[PDB]
Predict the 3D structure of the following.
Amino acid sequence: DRVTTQTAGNTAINTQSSLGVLCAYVEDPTKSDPPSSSTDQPTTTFTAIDRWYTGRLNSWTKAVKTFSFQAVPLPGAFLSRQGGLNGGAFTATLHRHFLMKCGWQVQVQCNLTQFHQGALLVAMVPETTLDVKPDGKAKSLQELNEEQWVEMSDDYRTGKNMPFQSLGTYYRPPNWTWGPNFINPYQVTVFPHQILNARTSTSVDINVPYIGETPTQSSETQNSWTLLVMVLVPLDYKEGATTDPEITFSVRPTSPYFNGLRNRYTAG
Amino acid sequence: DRVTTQTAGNTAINTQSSLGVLCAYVEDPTKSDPPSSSTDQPTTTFTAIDRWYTGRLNSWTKAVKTFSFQAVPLPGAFLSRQGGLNGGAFTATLHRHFLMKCGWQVQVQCNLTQFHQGALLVAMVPETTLDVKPDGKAKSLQELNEEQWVEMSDDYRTGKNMPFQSLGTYYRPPNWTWGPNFINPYQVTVFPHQILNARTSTSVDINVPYIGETPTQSSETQNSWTLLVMVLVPLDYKEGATTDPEITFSVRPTSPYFNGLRNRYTAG
Amino acid sequence: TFCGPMMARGKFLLSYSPPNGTQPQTLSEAMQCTYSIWDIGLNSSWTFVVPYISPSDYRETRAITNSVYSADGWFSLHKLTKITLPPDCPQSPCILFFASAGEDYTLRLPVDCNPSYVF
Amino acid sequence: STDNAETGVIEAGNTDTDFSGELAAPGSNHTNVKFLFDRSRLLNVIKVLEKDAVFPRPFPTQEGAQQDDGYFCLLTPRPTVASRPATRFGLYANPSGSGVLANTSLDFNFYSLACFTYFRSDLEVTVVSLEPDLEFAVGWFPSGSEYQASSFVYDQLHVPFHFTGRTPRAFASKGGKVSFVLPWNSVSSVLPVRWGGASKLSSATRGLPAHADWGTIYAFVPRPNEKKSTAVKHVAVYIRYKNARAWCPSMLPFRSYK
Amino acid sequence: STDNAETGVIEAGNTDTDFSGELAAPGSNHTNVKFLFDRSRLLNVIKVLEKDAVFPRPFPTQEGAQQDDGYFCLLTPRPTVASRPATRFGLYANPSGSGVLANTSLDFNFYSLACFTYFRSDLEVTVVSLEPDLEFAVGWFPSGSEYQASSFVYDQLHVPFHFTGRTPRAFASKGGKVSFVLPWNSVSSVLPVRWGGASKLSSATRGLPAHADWGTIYAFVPRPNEKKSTAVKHVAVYIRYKNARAWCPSMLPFRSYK
Amino acid sequence: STDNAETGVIEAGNTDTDFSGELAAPGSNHTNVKFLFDRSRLLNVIKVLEKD
């Protein structure tokens, strides 16, 4: 058992010691319909893009602390090209369609030995902004390698690290305390998730269909499923064990929905 | 009658004084099959690319001579982007598929007045190389605006203007006379074609299915259907008529066939 | 076929690309094309088949001029995550390679041989 | 028992999972989300209009501006500053100085139950004056629209336009209270309590869903403009949610330690 | 009549299209393309091998090279220079000087009928010696392959390998002639008489279809290497096409004026 | 896939063993051993006898 050879398009990934699947909210998530708000003929799926793209994430050592997480947005990951991960043909498509709509398979990657311990937590939270400190500039591919992890401060816990706006100098400068977007780390296992540790598994999967505030959000602005990995108990290993294991990931779109041709996107 | 509103994808072209269609060799040309030589699943058509792209060609004056032609290759036109004509999404697709296979709708463009005369000749010849003088460099988008027309020399008539090869200095330098690729202008109406003149029409169409030396040629090297426009009798117009009318064209692929993913093409 | 200690484990992908201009070198290039990742577990191998994309149905066997009809792009394999192994067990594992005909592999039309083995 | 929780999904276990004993009867159903929310709740207080109103500016505003602040109430549970949709929530603790204090608001006790990501309801507007012996008038315009502000003279008396119009008004009794239920009117599909996104395509503050809201209530007395008193007065506004739905659960606000 | 030719397609018109009279009987059928070509035709002559052969180089070649030129015959109707596929056709009219004259060839009278773009057949190889009282031997290897060239000694006599092998040989009689038919062997689908394309992906001469061909015939005498005469000799080669097909018509070679 | 070759016997794998695609037609049969060898081949040369 426990050997899951998943084949799509022309690629095929298997993880020999895996666990299973985990759908969300509907037992078969790939089913959908073309959106009702549009009127144009939607460009549906095609077999050249039904794919596992993979991409390297930062490694992890002794020096990490509890609740420290990486988080990658989606499909905004495909735009800025983190970790040697690009959509390739897929970005060349969704630059040219003002409406985009799709659900996601993910299986994440590690492999610790049998003389280790330490629990990760792979989960994809819905509808968050865990990539910006309030200056207004979204962080990009250069400033990922200076930290390797987000040390989980209190300002994400109290919702103080969401981008506010220019108050206008007619008023008083305020005293902010709360925002509705936050992360409560004692609570984060209410989302589709599974404990990945050196106990039983090596690589493990999530699966999720669509959620949205509208039938179809915009092309290059929305980010529904950020996925975040966070450590609950740190690693311990004696001198001679394999130092600093490596993390990558594998993202699959399922049943894409495009709408609306124009020129290739050039940012204003 | 004579009003043909042709709609594909989301675009729709009509030419109100047109003539009809002209298929070649089979009365319904769009029918095909996935190629037998491949083994991978081929990426078939999709509605986002079933399109009329259009693009501007050079204008034409009194000063032209008989049998002078423009000629645009295919799909090599989409690569080098002549005349404000690019494949857009289509080039981003066929850069990433080592085998390409498709047939073509074309309707070309002019509109002369009722006080003019002069006959063009729209025809797409098969399997020619009418874009290079033998240096070995294919001509590109900068050197089109210095001539506006190819003055039809004898060296295309005797097949002396095809790219030869380095003879090697062990031998004697030769005395070439003939090549199997040529143009005989007294003869060029054996191909799918129709006389376009100020007599009856304004814009007029060709249509052609696939031909090939193999089931599927390569991506970015083959050029089956070059289309060439050539003038048989020059224009005459008095002072007050519309000087130097303008020519563009409209190219439609039908039932594309892609094969073989890799990285986006970078030329060696 | 893998060969290493059972307490060692790694993730290896293997990738194939049809002829581009240059050769695909780093992981994005070998990523986009055609690949399979592979675990280390209780078994020890991973059967892979290079697909058969072609201009013409038959293909040559050796290239007198290394053209598109006779080559089909390079093959590579990359290490995706590090090999992971406990203390007091040796570094640098090993992997053997095999090569076999698939199902559709058919031959035709013989030629005179190369006697250069006898000299 | 002896199942492991690392598969992500574990069920519940009654007493006879491993012990001797039988499962207990279900007590009640004060749990269903279209009953739990249906509670009359005030969000804030409102300074009453008495003249030709003017409404606040876009995001930056230099001094010397003339707007009448704290007279509108963009009724949402989402955090709001100066009666326009903000993204964070202020509490002006050291208010000494110059420069006017903005009108903040938030629905306090809604989040402490809220384990959701998307929400859906209709609401009702309940108004009550705090000052005695008062008679007033409430107005409203829908979301994705904007207040009309001018005045037209009648028999030397300047009278503004918000006495009349299309969108409904309501005139109270002698110290009465006005209430009515109000349905959906939003351009988007469901109300988000979390959002990614931005307002326009580029060069926008990332996070505020500017057109997924309800609307606003303003109060004003039925008097002509030139007969206005010098004492200012106040009025509160109340909301009770109705027929609610909910989707795709999430976390809760972090409790102190502290 | 009164139709116009600008529609691109016009039919034929018999005598009763506009005149009085009746249409004439069909004469013959020497027109079908799988009968028209079936004619024995020589393309060229061949210098006869007598030793360990060596074959010419790739496209550039500096002086001091040692190859034996004009001994092979890459049999195609396509234009050929130095027994390797060229793209144009030479005629060395002023041959005085130094540097060796290349072996040119082309099938002259095939193009003057050829209104085609793609072609399909099988062929036959007919050989005939021009010099008297001669006995020889013809060899062959398929397209997309290459000649084997070495020698292995037997009883002090150096004997080359092209006496033996897999691919067929043929030994003639006392001044006889050898003929056999030969089928398709090409990697591509149909023979092109026109081509776009290039050999490899980039940095190649645009126009020569290097692997859409037939093969080559070489002649050699059945003698050991050390008993070779000083007088050179010649032999011709003939081709007749068989079972031909054709596709998607085109032009004809341009006739003089002149 | 995910079979191991250490059992000594592995079969062949077509394109749909792990990828998407269908198996290709058999081309020819110049493979059968009672056809492959049937070729006229010289092995050597011989000095001719003329006496006892």
